[PDB]
Coordinates of C-alpha atoms and ligand atoms in Angstrom, one line a residue:
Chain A
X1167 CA -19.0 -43.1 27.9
X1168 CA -21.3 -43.4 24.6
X1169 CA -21.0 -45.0 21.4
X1170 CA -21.7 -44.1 17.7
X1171 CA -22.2 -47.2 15.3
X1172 CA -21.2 -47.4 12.3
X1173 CA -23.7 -50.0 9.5
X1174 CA -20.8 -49.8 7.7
X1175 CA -18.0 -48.6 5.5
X1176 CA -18.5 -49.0 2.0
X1177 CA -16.0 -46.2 1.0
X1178 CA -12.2 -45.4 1.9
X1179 CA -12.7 -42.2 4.1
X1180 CA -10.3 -40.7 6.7
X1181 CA -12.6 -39.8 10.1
X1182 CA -12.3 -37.6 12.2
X1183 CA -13.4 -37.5 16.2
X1184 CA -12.9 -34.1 17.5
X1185 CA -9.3 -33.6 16.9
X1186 CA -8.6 -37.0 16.5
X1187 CA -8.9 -39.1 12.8
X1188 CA -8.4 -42.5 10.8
X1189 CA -8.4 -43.9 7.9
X1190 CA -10.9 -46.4 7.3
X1191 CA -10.7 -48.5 3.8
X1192 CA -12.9 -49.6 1.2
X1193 CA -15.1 -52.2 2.6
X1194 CA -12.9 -52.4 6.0
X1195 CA -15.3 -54.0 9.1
X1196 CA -15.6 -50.9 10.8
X1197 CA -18.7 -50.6 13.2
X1198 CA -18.1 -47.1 14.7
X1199 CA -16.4 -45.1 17.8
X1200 CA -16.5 -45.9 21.1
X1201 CA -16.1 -44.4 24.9
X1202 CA -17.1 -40.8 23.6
X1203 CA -16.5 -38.4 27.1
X1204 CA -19.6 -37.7 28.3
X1205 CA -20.3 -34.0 29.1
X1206 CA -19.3 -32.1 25.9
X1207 CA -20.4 -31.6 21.9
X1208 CA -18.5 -33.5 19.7
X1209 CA -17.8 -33.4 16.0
X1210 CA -17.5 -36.7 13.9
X1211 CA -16.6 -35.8 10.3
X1212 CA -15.3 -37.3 7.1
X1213 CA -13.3 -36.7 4.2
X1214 CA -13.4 -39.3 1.2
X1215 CA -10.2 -40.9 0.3
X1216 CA -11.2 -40.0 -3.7
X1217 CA -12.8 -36.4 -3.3
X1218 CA -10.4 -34.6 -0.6
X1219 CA -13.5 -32.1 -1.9
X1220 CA -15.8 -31.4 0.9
X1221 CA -14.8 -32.4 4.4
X1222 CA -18.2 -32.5 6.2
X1223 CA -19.5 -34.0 9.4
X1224 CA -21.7 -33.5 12.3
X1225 CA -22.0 -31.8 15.5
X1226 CA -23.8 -33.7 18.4
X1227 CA -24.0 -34.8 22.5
X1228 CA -24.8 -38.4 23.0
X1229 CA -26.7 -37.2 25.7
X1230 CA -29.5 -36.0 24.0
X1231 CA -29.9 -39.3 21.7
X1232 CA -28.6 -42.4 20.3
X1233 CA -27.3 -41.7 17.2
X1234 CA -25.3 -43.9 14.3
X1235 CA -23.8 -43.4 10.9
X1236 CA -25.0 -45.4 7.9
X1237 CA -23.6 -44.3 4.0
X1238 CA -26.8 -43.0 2.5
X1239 CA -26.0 -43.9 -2.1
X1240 CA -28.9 -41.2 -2.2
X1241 CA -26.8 -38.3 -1.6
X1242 CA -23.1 -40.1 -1.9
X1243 CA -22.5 -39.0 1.8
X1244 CA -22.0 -40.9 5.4
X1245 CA -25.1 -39.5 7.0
X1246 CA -25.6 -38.9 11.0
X1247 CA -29.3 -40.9 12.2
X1248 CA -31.1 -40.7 15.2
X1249 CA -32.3 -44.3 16.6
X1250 CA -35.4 -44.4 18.2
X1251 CA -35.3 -47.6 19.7
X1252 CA -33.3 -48.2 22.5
X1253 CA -33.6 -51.6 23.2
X1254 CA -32.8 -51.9 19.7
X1255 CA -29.6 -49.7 19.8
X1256 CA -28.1 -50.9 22.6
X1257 CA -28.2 -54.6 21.6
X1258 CA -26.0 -53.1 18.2
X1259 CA -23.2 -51.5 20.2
X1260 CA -22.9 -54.3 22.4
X1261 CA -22.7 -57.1 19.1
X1262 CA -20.1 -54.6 18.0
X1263 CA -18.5 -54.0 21.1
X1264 CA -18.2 -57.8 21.7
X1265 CA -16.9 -58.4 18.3
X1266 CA -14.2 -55.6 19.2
X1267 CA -15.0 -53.7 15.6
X1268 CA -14.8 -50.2 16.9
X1269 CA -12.4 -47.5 17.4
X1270 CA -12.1 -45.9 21.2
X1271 CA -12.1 -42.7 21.2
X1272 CA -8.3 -41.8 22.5
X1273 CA -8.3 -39.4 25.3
X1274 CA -5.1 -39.2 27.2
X1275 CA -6.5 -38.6 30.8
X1276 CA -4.1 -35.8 31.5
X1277 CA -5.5 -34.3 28.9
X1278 CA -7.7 -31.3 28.9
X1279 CA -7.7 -30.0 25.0
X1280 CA -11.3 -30.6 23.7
X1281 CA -12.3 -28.9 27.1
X1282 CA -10.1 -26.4 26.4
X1283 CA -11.6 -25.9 23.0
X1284 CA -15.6 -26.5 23.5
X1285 CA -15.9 -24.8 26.9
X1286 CA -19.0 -22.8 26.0
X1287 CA -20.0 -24.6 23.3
X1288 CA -23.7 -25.3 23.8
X1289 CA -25.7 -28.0 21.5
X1290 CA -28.6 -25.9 21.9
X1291 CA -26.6 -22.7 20.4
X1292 CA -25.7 -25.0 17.4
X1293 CA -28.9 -25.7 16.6
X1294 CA -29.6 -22.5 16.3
X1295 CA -26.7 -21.3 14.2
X1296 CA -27.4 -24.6 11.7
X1297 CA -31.4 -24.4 11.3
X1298 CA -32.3 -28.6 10.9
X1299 CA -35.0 -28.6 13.5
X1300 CA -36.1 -32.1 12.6
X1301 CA -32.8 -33.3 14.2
X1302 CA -30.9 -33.6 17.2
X1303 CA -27.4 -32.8 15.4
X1304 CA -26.1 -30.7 12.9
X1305 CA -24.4 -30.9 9.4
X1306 CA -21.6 -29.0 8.8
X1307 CA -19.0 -28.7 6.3
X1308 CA -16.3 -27.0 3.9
X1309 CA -18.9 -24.9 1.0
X1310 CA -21.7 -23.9 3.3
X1311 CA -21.8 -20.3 3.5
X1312 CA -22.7 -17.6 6.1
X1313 CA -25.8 -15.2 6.4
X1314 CA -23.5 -12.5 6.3
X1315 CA -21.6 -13.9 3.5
X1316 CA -25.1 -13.8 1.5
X1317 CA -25.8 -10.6 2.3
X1318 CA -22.6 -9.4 0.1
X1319 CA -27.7 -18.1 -1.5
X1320 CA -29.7 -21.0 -0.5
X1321 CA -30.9 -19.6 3.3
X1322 CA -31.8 -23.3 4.5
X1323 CA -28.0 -24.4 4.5
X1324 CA -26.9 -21.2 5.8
X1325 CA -24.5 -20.8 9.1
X1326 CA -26.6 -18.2 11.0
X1327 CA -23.9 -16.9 12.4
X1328 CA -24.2 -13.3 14.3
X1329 CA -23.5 -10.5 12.2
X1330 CA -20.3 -8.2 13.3
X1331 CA -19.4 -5.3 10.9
X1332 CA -17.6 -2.6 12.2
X1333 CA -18.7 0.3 9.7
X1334 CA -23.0 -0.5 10.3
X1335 CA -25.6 1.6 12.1
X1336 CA -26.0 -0.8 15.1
X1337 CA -21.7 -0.4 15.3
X1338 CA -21.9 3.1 15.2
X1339 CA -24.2 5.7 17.3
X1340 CA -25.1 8.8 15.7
X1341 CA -22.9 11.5 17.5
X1342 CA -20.6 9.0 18.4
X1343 CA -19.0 7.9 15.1
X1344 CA -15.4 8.6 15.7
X1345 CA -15.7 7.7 19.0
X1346 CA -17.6 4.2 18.3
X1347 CA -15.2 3.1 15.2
X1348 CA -11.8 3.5 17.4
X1349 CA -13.4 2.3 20.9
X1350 CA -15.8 -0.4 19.8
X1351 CA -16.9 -1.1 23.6
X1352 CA -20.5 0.0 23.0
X1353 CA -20.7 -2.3 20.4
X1354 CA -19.1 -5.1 22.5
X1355 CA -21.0 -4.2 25.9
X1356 CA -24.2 -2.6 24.7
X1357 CA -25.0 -4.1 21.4
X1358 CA -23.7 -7.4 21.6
X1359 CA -23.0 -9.2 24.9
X1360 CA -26.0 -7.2 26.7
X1361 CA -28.4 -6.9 23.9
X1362 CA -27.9 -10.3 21.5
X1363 CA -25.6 -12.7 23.6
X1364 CA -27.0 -11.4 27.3
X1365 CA -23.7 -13.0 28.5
X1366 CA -20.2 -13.5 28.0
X1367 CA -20.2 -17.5 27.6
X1368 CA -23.4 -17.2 24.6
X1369 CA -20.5 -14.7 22.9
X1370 CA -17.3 -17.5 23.6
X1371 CA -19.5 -20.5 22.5
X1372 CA -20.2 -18.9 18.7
X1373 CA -16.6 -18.0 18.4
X1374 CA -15.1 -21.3 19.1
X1375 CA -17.5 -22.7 17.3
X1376 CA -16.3 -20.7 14.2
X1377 CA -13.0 -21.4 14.8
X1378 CA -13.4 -25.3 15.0
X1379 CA -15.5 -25.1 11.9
X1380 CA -12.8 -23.1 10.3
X1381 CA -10.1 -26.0 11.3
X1382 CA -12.3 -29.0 10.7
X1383 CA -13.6 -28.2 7.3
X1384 CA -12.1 -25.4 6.3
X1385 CA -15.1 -23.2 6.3
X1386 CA -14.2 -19.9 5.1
X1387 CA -17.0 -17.9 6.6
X1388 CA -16.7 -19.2 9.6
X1389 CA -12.4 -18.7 9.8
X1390 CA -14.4 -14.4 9.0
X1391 CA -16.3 -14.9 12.0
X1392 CA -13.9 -16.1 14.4
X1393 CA -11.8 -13.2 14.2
X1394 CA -14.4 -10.7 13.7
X1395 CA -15.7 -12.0 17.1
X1396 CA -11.6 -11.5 18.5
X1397 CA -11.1 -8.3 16.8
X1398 CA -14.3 -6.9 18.4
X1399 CA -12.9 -7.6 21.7
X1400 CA -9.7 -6.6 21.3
X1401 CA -11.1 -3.4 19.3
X1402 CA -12.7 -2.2 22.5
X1403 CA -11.0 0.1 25.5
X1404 CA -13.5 -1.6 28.1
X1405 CA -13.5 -5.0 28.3
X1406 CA -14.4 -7.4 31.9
X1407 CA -11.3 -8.2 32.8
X1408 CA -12.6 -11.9 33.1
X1409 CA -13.6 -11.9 29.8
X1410 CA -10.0 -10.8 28.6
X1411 CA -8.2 -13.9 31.0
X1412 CA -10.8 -16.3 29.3
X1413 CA -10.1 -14.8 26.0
X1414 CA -6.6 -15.3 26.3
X1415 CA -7.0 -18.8 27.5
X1416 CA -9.8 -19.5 24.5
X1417 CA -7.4 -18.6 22.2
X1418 CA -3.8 -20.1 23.5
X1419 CA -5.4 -23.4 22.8
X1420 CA -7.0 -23.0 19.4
X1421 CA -3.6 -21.6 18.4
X1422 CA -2.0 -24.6 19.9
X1423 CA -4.5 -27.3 18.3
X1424 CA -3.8 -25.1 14.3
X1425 CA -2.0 -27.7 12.2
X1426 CA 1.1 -25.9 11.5
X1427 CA 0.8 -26.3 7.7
X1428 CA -2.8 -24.7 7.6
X1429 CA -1.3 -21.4 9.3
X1430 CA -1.2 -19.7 6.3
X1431 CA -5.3 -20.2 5.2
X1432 CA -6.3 -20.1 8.4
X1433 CA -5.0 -17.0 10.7
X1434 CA -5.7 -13.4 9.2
X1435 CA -2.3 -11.7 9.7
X1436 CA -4.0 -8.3 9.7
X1437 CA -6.3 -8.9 12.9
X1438 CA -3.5 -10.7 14.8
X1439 CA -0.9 -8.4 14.1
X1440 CA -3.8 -5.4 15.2
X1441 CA -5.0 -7.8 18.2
X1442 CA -1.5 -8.3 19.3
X1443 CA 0.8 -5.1 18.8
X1444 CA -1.7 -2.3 18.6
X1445 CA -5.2 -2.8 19.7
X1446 CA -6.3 -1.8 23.2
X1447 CA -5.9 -5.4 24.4
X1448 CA -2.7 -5.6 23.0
X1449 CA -1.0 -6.4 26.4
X1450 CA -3.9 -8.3 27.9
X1451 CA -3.2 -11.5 26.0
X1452 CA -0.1 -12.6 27.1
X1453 CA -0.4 -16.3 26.4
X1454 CA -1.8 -16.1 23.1
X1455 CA 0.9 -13.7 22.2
X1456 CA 3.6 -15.9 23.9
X1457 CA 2.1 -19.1 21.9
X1458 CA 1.6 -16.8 18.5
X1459 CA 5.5 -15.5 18.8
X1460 CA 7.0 -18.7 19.2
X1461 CA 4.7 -21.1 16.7
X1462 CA 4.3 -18.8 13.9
X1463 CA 6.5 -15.5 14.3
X1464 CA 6.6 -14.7 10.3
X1465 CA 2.8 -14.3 10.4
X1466 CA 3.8 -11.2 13.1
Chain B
X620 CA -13.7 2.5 -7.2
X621 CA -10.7 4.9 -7.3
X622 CA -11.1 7.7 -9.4
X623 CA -7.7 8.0 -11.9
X624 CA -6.8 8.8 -15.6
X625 CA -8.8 6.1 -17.0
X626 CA -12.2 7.5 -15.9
X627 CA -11.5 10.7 -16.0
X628 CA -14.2 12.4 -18.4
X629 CA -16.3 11.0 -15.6
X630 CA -15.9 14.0 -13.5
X631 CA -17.8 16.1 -15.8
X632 CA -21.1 13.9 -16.3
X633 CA -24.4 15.3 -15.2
X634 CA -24.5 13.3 -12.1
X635 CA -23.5 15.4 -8.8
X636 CA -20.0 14.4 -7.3
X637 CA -18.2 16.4 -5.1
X638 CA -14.6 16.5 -4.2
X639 CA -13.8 16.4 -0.2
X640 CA -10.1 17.5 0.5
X641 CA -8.5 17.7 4.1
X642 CA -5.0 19.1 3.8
X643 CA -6.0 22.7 5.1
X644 CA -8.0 21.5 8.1
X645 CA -5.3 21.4 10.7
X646 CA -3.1 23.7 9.8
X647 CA -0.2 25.2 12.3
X648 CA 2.9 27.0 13.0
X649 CA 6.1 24.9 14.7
X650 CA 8.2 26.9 17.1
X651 CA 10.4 27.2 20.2
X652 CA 9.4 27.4 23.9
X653 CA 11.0 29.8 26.6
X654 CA 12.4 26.5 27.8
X655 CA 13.9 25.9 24.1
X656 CA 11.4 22.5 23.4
X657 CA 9.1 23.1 20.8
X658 CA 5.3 23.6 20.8
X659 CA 3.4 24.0 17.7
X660 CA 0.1 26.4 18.1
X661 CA -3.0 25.5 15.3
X662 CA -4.0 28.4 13.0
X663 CA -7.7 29.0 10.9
X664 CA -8.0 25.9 8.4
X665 CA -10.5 24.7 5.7
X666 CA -12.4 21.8 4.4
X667 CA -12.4 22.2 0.2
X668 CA -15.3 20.7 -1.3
X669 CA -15.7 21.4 -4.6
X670 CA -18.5 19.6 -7.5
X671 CA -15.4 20.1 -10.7
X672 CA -18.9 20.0 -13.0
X673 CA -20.1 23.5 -11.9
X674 CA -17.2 25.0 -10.2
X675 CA -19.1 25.2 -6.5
X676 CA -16.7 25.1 -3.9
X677 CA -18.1 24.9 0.2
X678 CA -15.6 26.1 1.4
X679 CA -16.0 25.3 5.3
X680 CA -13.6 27.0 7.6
X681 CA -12.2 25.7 10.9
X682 CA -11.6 28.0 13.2
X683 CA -9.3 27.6 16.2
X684 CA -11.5 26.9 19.0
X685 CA -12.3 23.5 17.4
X686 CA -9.1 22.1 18.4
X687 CA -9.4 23.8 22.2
X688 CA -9.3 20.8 25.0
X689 CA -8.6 17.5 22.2
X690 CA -6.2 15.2 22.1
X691 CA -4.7 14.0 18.6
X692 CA -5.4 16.7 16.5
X693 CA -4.4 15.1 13.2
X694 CA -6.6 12.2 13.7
X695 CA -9.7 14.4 14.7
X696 CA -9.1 16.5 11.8
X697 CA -10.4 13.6 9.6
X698 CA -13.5 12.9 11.5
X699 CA -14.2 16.9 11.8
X700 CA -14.2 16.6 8.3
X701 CA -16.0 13.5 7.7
X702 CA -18.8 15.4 10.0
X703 CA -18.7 18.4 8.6
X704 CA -19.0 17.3 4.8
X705 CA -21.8 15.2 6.1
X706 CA -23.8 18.1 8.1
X707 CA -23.3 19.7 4.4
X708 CA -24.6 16.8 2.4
X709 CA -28.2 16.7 5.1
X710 CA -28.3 20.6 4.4
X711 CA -28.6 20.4 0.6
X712 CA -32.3 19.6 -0.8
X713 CA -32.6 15.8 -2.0
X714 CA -31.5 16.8 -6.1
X715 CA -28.5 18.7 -4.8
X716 CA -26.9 15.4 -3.0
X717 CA -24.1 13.8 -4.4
X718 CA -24.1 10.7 -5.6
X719 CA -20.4 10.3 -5.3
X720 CA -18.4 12.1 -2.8
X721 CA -14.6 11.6 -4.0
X722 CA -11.3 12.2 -1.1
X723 CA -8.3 12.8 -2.6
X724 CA -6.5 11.4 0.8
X725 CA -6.9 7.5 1.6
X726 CA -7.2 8.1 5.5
X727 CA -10.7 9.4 4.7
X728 CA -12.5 7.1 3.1
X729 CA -13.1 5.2 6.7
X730 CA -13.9 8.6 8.5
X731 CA -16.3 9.8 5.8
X732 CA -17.7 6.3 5.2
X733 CA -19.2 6.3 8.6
X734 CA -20.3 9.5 9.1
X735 CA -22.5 8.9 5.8
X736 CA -23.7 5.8 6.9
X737 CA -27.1 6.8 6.5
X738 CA -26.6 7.5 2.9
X739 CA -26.0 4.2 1.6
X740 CA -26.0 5.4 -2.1
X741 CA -23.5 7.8 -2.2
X742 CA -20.6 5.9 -3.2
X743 CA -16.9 7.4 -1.4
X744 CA -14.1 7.3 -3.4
X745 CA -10.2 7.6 -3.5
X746 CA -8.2 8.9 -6.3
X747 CA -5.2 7.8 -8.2
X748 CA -5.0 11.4 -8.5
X749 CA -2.1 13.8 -7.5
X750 CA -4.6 17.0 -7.2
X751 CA -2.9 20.2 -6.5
X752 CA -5.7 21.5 -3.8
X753 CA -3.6 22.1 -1.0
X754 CA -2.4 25.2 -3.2
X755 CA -6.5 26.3 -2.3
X756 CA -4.5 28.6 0.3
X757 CA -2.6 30.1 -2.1
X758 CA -5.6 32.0 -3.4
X759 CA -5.4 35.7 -1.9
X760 CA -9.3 35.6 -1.6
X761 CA -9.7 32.4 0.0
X762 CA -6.7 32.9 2.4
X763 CA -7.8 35.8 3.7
X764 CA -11.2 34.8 4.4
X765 CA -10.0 31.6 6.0
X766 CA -7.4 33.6 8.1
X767 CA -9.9 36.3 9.4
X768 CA -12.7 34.2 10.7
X769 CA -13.4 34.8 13.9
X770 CA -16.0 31.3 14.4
X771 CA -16.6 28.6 12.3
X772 CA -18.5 29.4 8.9
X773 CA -19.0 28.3 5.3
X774 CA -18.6 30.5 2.7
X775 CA -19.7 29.2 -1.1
X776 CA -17.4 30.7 -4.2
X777 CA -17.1 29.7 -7.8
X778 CA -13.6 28.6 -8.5
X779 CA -13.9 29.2 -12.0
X780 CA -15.7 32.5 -12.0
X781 CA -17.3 32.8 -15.2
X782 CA -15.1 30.6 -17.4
X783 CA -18.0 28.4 -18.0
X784 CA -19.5 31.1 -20.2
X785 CA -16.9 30.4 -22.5
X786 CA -15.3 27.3 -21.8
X787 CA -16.3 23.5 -20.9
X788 CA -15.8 22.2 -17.2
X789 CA -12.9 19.5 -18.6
X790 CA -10.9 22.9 -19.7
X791 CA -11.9 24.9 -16.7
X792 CA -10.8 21.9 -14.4
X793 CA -7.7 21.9 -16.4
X794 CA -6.8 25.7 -16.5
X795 CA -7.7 25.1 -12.4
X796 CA -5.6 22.2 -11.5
X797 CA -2.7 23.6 -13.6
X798 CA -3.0 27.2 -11.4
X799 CA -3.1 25.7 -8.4
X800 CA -0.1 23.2 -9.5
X801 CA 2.1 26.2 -10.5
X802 CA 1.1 27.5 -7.2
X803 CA 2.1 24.9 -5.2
X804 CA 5.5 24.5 -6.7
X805 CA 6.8 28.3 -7.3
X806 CA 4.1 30.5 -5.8
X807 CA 6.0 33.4 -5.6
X808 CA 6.0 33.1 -9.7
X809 CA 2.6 31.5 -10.1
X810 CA 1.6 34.6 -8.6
X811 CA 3.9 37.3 -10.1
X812 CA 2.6 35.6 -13.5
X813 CA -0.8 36.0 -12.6
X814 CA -0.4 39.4 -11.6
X815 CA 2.8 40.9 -13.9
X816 CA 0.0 43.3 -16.0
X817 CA -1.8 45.7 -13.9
X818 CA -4.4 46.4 -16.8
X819 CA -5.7 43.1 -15.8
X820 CA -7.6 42.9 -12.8
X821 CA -9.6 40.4 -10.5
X822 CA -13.5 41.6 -10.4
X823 CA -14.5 42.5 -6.8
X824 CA -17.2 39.2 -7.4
X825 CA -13.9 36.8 -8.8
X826 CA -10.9 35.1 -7.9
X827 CA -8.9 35.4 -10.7
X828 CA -7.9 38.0 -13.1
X829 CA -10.3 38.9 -15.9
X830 CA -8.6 37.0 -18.9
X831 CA -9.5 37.4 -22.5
X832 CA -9.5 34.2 -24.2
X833 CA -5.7 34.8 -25.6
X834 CA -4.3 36.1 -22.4
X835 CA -5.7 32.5 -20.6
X836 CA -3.3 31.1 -23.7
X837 CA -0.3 32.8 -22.3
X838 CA -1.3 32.6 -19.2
X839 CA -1.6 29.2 -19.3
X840 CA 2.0 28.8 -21.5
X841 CA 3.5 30.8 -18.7
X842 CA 2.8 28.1 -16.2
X843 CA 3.5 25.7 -17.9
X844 CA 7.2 26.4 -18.7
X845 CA 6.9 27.7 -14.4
X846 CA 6.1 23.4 -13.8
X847 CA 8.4 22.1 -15.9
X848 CA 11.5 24.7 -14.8
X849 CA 11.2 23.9 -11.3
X850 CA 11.4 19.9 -12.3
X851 CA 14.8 20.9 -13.4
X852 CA 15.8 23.7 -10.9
X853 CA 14.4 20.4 -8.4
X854 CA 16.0 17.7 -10.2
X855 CA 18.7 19.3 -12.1
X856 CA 17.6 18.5 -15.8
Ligands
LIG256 N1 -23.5 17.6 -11.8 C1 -24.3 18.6 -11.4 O1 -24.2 19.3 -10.5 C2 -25.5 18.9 -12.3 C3 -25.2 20.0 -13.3 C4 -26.3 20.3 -14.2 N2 -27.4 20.8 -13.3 C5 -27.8 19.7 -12.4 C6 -26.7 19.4 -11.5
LIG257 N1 -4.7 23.6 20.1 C1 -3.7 24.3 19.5 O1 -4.0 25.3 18.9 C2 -2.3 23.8 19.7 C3 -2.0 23.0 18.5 C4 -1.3 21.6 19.0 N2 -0.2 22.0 19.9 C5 -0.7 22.6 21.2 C6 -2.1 23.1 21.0

C-alpha cells in the first residue's frame, strides 16, 4: 500500500482518488492519501471549489516512484512531483501518518470496480498517449484536446490518441469500399489490432482510458474516442469471440460507474443505439445491453 | 453544403459540377409466382450524370447481369453507382474533373464519399432540391437505349440539344427541369404536348422537338397549366 503527500492545502478543492472524492477546505491540515492498492494506475485529480472550470489531475503507479502534491502559485494549480530522495520521503509519510493527517484511500475489499475499469490500462501506454517524458506521470484534464481533434492546436498538450475514422484510406481498401464501410473487420483485425495495437489488451487499455478521461474531466475528445474504439468493434462481422466477452464485460462496468446525471453529455445515443439494436454485435453484448436497458432506457 | 434555392445561380458558374442521380439504377417489375407469392425480376437501369452548365449527360447504363448472384440489390445499387461515377471521374483528363459532384438522394453521399476518397477536393453534395430526373426514362431516346442494351455501356448525349445557341444554361435548366416535371406527373400529356404538331419534329442527332423560339413559349405555357392541373385533379383545388 503507497502513499501520496500532500505539502498542503492552501485552496478549497474537492479531490478525487479514482472514483472516490472529498472536499478539502481552505487552509484545512490535509497531508495527502493513503493505502493506494498496489498493482494498478491511478488517477488523483482536482476541482477548485471557486472555478468548477477545469477539473484536471494526474495519472500514475506508485510503483514506479514516490511522488507528492504541493500547490505550485506559478501556474494556480495542485501540481504532481516526483521525490528523489527516499530516505527523505519516507520520513514525510510517516510524520503524517503518525499525526493521522491523511485520507485512506476507501476500498471495500469485496470490491472489484477500479479492476474492473483499469484492467489493461498500462502506465507505459499513457505515457505515450500524454507526451511529458521528463516525468513519471501524466497531466490530464477537461480543455486538452485530441490529435485528431487538431486535424479538423498546441501539439505538446495534445492526447495522442489513435486515430479511428471510418470514411479514410487506411479504413477503406481500394476494391473493397462497400464491402470495408459496412463490415469494418479489416480495419479492426488487419489495420488496427494486428498492425498498430499488435494485440487485443494495447486496443482495451486506450479505450478505457478514453472513457475514464471522459468521466473524470469531462474531456470531450476523449468521450469521441471511446466510442469510436466500441463502434469499430461492434461495426465489424468478425470479431474474437474473446474480445466480444471482454468487451461486454469492459463496458457493463463503465456503464455502471456513469454518474447518472452526466448520462446525457456523456453517452452518444447514436453509437449505442447502432452498437446495441443493429450492429453485427448487436446480440453479443448482453450485459451491457441488460445494464444500458435498465439504467438509462430513454437514451435507447 | 447542400445545394437549394439560395445558391442556386451557382449551378451555372464556370467551375465543373456534375449531378449524380440513382433513381433509374435498379429498376424492376413486381409480379406473381406459379405458387401465387410474388417475385420481382430487375430490368436495364441507368446512372444520370449530368454537368446543368453544358448540358453533358453520362448516361451509364446498368444492364441486368449486374445484379446476377447479389444479395440486397437496393443497397448495392448505391455503391454500383458510387463506383461507377467514380471510374468516370478517373476517365476524364485532369481540366474535365469536377470540382463538385452534387446527389440529389441523401443515401449517397456516404457511398460516393468513399469511393472518391482519393479525390479529396471534390466536394459531394446533397440538395434541398426536388429535381424531376427520375422522369430521364420518360425520354423516348434515352428509354430505348437504356432498354436495348445488351452489356453494360455509357453513352454521352446533350440534354439540351442546341438550346444553348440561343439560350443561357439557367433557362435551358429551367425549360429541362420543367419537361421532365410535366413528365413525371402526366406523361401521357407531357408527351401528347410535345408531340400534338407533326410539322415539328425531333432531329435524328436531338432529343426534343426542333422548337422555334415562340413555339418553346407555348410549349412551355402548355406545361405549365399540365403542373398546376394535376395539383388540382391530385388535390382537388
Ligand atoms: N463548367 C464547365 O464545364 C466549364 C464550361 C466552360 N468550359 C470549361 C468547362
Ligand atoms: N436479379 C434479378 O433480376 C431479380 C431482381 C430481384 N428479385 C429476384 C432477382
Amino acid at each position: 500500500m503507497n502513499t501520496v503527500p500532500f505539502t498542503s492545502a492552501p485552496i478549497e478543492v474537492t479531490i478525487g482518488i479514482d472514483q472516490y472524492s472529498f472536499n478539502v477546505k481552505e487552509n484545512q491540515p490535509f497531508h495527502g492519501i493513503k493505502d493506494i492498492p498496489i498493482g494498478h494506475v491511478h488517477v488523483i485529480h482536482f476541482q477548485h471549489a471557486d472555478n468548477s472550470s477545469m477539473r484536471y489531475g494526474y495519472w500514475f503507479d506508485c510503483r514506479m516512484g514516490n511522488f507528492y502534491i504541493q500547490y505550485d502559485p506559478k501556474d494556480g494549480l495542485y501540481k504532481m512531483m516526483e521525490e528523489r530522495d527516499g530516505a527523505k520521503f519516507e520520513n514525510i509519510v510517516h510524520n503524517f501518518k503518525e499525526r493521522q493527517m491523511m485520507v485512506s484511500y476507501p476500498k471495500i475489499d469485496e470490491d472489484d470496480t477500479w479492476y474492473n475499469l483499469t484492467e489493461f490500462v498500462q502506465m507505459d501506454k499513457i505515457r505515450k498517449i500524454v507526451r511529458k517524458d521528463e516525468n513519471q506521470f501524466s497531466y490530464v484534464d477537461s480543455s486538452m484536446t485530441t490529435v485528431q481533434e487538431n486535424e479538423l492546436s498546441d501539439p505538446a498538450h495534445s492526447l495522442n490518441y489513435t486515430v479511428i475514422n471510418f470514411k479514410s484510406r487506411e479504413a477503406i481498401r481500394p476494391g473493397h469500399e462497400m464491402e470495408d464501410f459496412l463490415d469494418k473487420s479489416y480495419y479492426l483485425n488487419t489495420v488496427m489490432l494486428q498492425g498498430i495495437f499488435k494485440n487485443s489488451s494495447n486496443y482495451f487499455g486506450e479505450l478505457q482510458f478514453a472513457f475514464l478521461n471522459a468521466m473524470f474531466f469531462g474531456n470531450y475528445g476523449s468521450s469521441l474516442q471511446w466510442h469510436a474504439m466500441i463502434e469499430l468493434i461492434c461495426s465489424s462481422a468478425t470479431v474474437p469471440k474473446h474480445m466480444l466477452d471482454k468487451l461486454d464485460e469492459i463496458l457493463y462496468y463503465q456503464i455502471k460507474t456513469l454518474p447518472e446525471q452526466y448520462s446525457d453529455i456523456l453517452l452518444n445515443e447514436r453509437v449505442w443505439n447502432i452498437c446495441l439494436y443493429s450492429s453485427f454485435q448487436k446480440n453479443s453484448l448482453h450485459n451491457t445491453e441488460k445494464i444500458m436497458e435498465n439504467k438509462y432506457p430513454e437514451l435507447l | 453544403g447542400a445545394m437549394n434555392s439560395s445558391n442556386y445561380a451557382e449551378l451555372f458558374n464556370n467551375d465543373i459540377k456534375l449531378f449524380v442521380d440513382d433513381t433509374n439504377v435498379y429498376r424492376v417489375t413486381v409480379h406473381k409466382t406459379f405458387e401465387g407469392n410474388v417475385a420481382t425480376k430487375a430490368i436495364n437501369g441507368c446512372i444520370f450524370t449530368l454537368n446543368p452548365k453544358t448540358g453533358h449527360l453520362f448516361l451509364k447504363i446498368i444492364h441486368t447481369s449486374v445484379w446476377a448472384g447479389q444479395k440486397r440489390l437496393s443497397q448495392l445499387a448505391k455503391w454500383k453507382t458510387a463506383e461507377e461515377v467514380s471510374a468516370l471521374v478517373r476517365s476524364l483528363p485532369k481540366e474535365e474533373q469536377p470540382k463538385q459532384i452534387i446527389v440529389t438522394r441523401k443515401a449517397m453521399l456516404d457511398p460516393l464519399e468513399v469511393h472518391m476518397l482519393d479525390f479529396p477536393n471534390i466536394a459531394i453534395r446533397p440538395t434541398e432540391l426536388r429535381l424531376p430526373f427520375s422522369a430521364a426514362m420518360s425520354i423516348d431516346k434515352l428509354s430505348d437505349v437504356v432498354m436495348k442494351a445488351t452489356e453494360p455501356q455509357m453513352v454521352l448525349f446533350n440534354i439540351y440539344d442546341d438550346w444553348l445557341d440561343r439560350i443561357s444554361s439557367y433557362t435551358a435548366f429551367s425549360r429541362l427541369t420543367l419537361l421532365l416535371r410535366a413528365l413525371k406527373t402526366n406523361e401521357e400529356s407531357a408527351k401528347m404536348i410535345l408531340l400534338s404538331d407533326p410539322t415539328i419534329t425531333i432531329k435524328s442527332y436531338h432529343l426534343w422537338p426542333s422548337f422555334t423560339d415562340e413555339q418553346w413559349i407555348t410549349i412551355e405555357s402548355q406545361m405549365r397549366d399540365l403542373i398546376l392541373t394535376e395539383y388540382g385533379r391530385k388535390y382537388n383545388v
